[PDB]
Amino acid sequence: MGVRKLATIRTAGEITPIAGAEAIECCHVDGWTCVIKKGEFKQGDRGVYFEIDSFIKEDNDRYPMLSKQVIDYEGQRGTRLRTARLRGQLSQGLFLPMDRFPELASNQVGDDVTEILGITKWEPPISTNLSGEILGEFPTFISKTDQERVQNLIPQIEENKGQKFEVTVMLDGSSMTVYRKDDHIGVCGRNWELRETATNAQWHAARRNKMIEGLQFLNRNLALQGEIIGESIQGNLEKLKGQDFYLFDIYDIDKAQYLTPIERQSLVKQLNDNGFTVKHVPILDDLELNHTAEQILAMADGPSLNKNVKREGLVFKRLDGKFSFKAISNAYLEKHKDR
Numbered sequence: 319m320g321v322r323k324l325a326t327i328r329t330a331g332e333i334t335p336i337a338g339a340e341a342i343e344c345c346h347v348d349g350w351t352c353v354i355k356k357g358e359f360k361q362g363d364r365g366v367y368f369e370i371d372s373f374i375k376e377d378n379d380r381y382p383m384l385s386k387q388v389i390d391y392e393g394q395r396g397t398r399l400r401t402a403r404l405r406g407q408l409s410q411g412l413f414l415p416m417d418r419f420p421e422l423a424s425n426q427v428g429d430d431v432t433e434i435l436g437i438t439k440w441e442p443p444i445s446t447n448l449s450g451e452i453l454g455e456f457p458t459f460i461s462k463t464d465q466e467r468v469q470n471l472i473p474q475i476e477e478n479k480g481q482k483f484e485v486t487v488m489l490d491g492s493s494m495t496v497y498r499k500d501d502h503i504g505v506c507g508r509n510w511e512l513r514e515t516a517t518n519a520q521w522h523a524a525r526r527n528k529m530i531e532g533l534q535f536l537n538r539n540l541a542l543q544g545e546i547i548g549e550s551i552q553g554n555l556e557k558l559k560g561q562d563f564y565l566f567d568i569y570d571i572d573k574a575q576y577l578t579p580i581e582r583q584s585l586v587k588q589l590n591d592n593g594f595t596v597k598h599v600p601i602l603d604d605l606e607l608n609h610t611a612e613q614i615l616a617m618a619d620g621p622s623l624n625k626n627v628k629r630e631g632l633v634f635k636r637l638d639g640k641f642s643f644k645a646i647s648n649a650y651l652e653k654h655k656d657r
């Protein structure tokens with residue numbers, strides 16, 4: 319899920335009427351709920367579902383319903399899809415019937431049609447503080463930080479009932495990776511490896527908590543992955559003075575896998591024992607899964623690291639390290655229109 323699966327062929331679920339608003343109804347699409355024109359689908363119908371964060375280029379033939387939300391973004395004219403609320407009812411995504419896409423009459427349920435519809439991914443601007451000097455590509459020997467949304471995991475949420483999960487708070491900052499491979503120690507943003515300058519915010523955070531020394535102490539090819547947050551980083555939800563790093567993952571570069579949560583929270587223990595103050599994203603009570611997606615979304619709303627603000631949401635990592643997912647707070651998305 320990195321620019322991929324924004325537009326997929328999916329199936330209408332339960333179609334509920336909107337009391338008082340007769341021209342439209344609410345369509346369940348997997349874990350999503352979506353406002354449609356009345357009678358546009360019956361339950362069981364297939365259509366293309368365009369997730370929130372889809373950027374769709376203007377076309378009043380195909381996308382007239384998006385006409386008066388066209389904008390300029392990367393010098394591209396088109397409509398960003400985002401969370402909205404229609405008459406007390408949450409609405410996320412666009413769900414159009416297959417008869418609208420002639421080119422897709424061969425395709426099958428669940429096909430990713432993003433590429434072939436030319437759909438791109440809207441994202442917030444990267445923070446002005448954090449565009450440093452690029453050294454290299456994000457190393458290909460490290461995975462980027464990424465979770466599938468719970469809304470897209472109905473059969474897997476079923477399958478996993480009874481399984482236990484590390485539950486962690488999702489922080490609104492910027493992805494940062496600090497790693498060792500042999501004689502090299504590097505620091506990465508989301509997409510790129512960075513040069514150490516005096517102005518580099520990520521390199522500064524890594525020096526300060528001594529996580530570089532940490533990796534020199536551990537003597538392993540590891541990537542420390544987490545969130546840089548604070549002042550002048552994405553509106554500073556947590557109301558920090560200055561800035562800081564909070565780990566949420568460690569990637570084993572030799573074995574080419576993440577460390578399970580217990581593997582991970584032990585290593586952090588020893589770092590803090592040897593004088594390496596590496597902070598971890600807030601960890602909550604472990605979860606035994608026996609929930610709907612809808613229930614998981616409800617538990618995502620809650621307090622953040624700063625417990626006086628509403629959090630971005632939660633991440634769930636099965637304790638064997640072989641299944642993880644995120645649930646973004648819909649309350650958060652309602653309050654935060656740049657999200």
Ligand SMILES: [Mn+2]
Nearest residue numbers: 489490491492
């Ligand atoms: Mn984020």
